[PDB]
Amino acid sequence: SKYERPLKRESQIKEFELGTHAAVIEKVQKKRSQKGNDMFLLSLLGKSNEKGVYFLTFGNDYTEDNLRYILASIQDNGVEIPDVDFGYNRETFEFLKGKDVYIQVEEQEYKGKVKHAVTNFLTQDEFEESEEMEFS
Amino acid sequence: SKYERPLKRESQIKEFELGTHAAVIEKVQKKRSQKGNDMFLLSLLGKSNEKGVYFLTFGNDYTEDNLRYILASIQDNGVEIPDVDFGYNRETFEFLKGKDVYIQVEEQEYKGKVKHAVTNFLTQDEFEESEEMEFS
Amino acid sequence: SKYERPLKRESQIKEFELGTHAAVIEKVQKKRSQKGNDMFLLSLLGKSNEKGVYFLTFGNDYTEDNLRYILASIQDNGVEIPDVDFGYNRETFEFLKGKDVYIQVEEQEYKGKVKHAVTNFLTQDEFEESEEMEFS
DNA sequence: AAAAAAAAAAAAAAA
């Protein structure tokens, strides 16, 4: 094919350790998956510069519930959830950017490659239940 | 099978230190993989005779982008890109030879043996971002 | 059990010193491995009566490559490679006998016992390049 | 809960 300038790629030097972490959604991209689903690609920034990615895929039974947990995590980091129809729309897209969240980070295999993946957005209850088990 | 001069093999004494470097594509070579994929074998040379190799495999869905990043790295080193169809062809083969590039080199574990392998080709943006964080 | 006459064993008094060497393929004999692959057993005679052995083992992914390098070594000693199918056949078998080659010999250890073994066949440029860095 | 993902490349064998 003919050359077409490709995009700058973000350096993902450092992953999240396994467990629960406070993180901020440092970026939100609108993309389409390889199987042709509309998704929001949440980029996640930790307090020691840990980078992580999360895919909010649309057009299935879980999408609604999935996003409610993202919103609930935002709510419990001290932000009011506005009166808007949440889903595949610009309000939702813009609302997520820059927000404090609680994330879970589990291991995950794919093509025999193990990485630390962001799996879930946690409520206050879930974040503390997990965090109050750790010994300094 | 009928005879086919195998590719000359060099002394891999000095390899690239970890991180990102300016390099040249010293040699390009046609080669069939163990799984039976066509690839170009890019020999990279550094400013103090560090050596490394890069496997540009054809067939995969990443081929295009992977080559795009090679080309874009060449673009950002002062060479302009011809209006040719880039791929598994002769023009591509001849173009890549003797071109200044930006590369990343990470640690790569394979069957016990860790070694410093060229992983990516970097754009100007990518390159300056990681090179500007070094001190004196 | 019942006595069968055993075969004469060739006197392997002196072995190659480590490094690169001009040598002749003095003998070639096809055998079965302990694991049970067909293979050629190249005997190699040095210019000071050094004796070494090389095992070209058939039935693996790199059989053809290892053979190609042998032929390349013969090619670069003033011999033209004919348009023959190279492999486990009589023609390849008989072509190898008596040819000049360049060999590499390294230390090797099987059952505690150390041995100078023939590990590779070198091209012209490969041979000269090894001889360059010996003078230092 | 369902869906997301850079793919691919590396001697093996002899004794």
DSSP labels, chain B: -----PPP-----SBPPSEEEEEEEEEEEEEE-TTS-EEEEEEEE-TT--EEEEEEESSSTTHHHHHHHHHHHHHTTT----SS--SSSHHHHHHHTT-EEEEEEEEEEETTEEEEEEEEE--HHHHHHHHTT---
For residue A52, tell me if it sits in a domain. yes
Q: Greatest CA span in chain B, whole angstroms?
A: 56
Token couple for C19: 């490094």
> Which residues does C contribute to its contact with B (CB < 8 Å)?
61, 64-65, 68-69, 71-72, 75, 81, 83-87, 123, 125-126, 129-130, 133
Give the Å distances, CA to CA, from B116 to B12, B18, B62.
11, 7, 22
- With respect to residue B67, please indicate whether it lies within any of the assigned structural domains: yes
Output the six-digit token pair for B81.
């890109």
Total count of domains within chain A: 1
CB B100 within 8 A of CB B78: yes
- For this experimental structure, what is the resolution in angstroms? 2.7
Distance A96 CA to D9 C1' (A): 39
Q: What is the Cβ-side half-sphere exposure of residue C49, based on CA atoms within 13 angstroms?
A: 5
Strand-pairing partners, residue A106, are: A117
Query: Nearest 5°: phi and psi at C84?
Result: -125, 150
Residue C83 lies in a domain: yes
Distance CA B32, CA C115 (A): 34
On whether the CB atoms of residues A41 and A53 are closer than 8 A, the answer is yes
What is the C-alpha to C-alpha distance for residues B89 and B40, in angstroms, rounded to an integer?
10
Residue B3 lies inside a defined structural domain of this protein: no
Question: Residue C130: which H helix or E strand, with range?
Answer: helix C124-134
Task: Please state, in angstroms and rounded to a whole number, the distance separating the CA atoms of residues B11 and C73.
Answer: 17
* The token pair that represents B11 in the structure block: 């002394």
Sheet with B38-45, side-by-side order of all strands: B51-57, B38-45, B19-32, B100-110, B113-121
Q: How far apart are CA B89 and CA C29, in angstroms?
A: 43
Closest CA to B12 of B54, B53, B56: B53
CATH of the domain at A30: 2.40.50
User: Best residue in C102, C129, C136 to probe B by mutation, most B CBs within 10 Å?
Assistant: C129
Q: Running DSSP on this structure, what letter comes out for residue A3?
A: -
- Measured CA distances, B55 to B28, B41, C10 (Å): 10, 5, 45
* Domain-embedded: residue C11: no
Backbone angles phi, psi at B74, to 5 degrees: -70, -40
> Across chain C, which distance is largest between two alpha carbons, in Å?
58
What is the domain extent for residue B73? Answer: 19-131
- B62's CB contacts (< 8 A; 6+ apart) are none
Give the dihedral sign, CA A110/A114/A118/A119: positive
Method used experimentally: X-ray
Q: What are phi and psi of A36, to 5 degrees?
A: 85, 40
Query: Which residues in chain C are closer than 8 Å to B3, comparing Cβ atoms?
Result: 68, 71, 81, 83-84, 86
In a 13 Å sphere around the CA of A18, the CA atoms on its Cβ side amount to 6
Touch A-C: 3+ C-beta pairs under 8 A: no
CA C58, CA B82: separation in Å to the nearest integer? 46
Q: Coil, helix or strand for A121?
A: strand
Residue B112 makes CB contacts below 8 A (sequence gap 6+) with: none
> B50: which strand partners?
none
Contacts of B34 in chain C (CB under 8 A): 61
Asked if the structure places residue A10 within a domain, the reply is no
Query: Closest residue of C to B31, CA-based?
Result: C65
Are B120 and B33 within 8 A, CB to CB?
no
Q: CA A123 to CA A113: how far, in whole Å? A: 29
Opening angle at CA C100, ends C95 and C103, nearest 5: 110
What contacts C6, CB < 8 A, 6 or more positions away?
Answer: none
What's the token pair of residue B14?
A: 């000095």
Q: Specify if C5 maps to a domain.
A: no
User: Does a structural domain hold residue A7?
Assistant: no
Q: Which pair of structure tokens corresponds to residue B51?
A: 């050596």
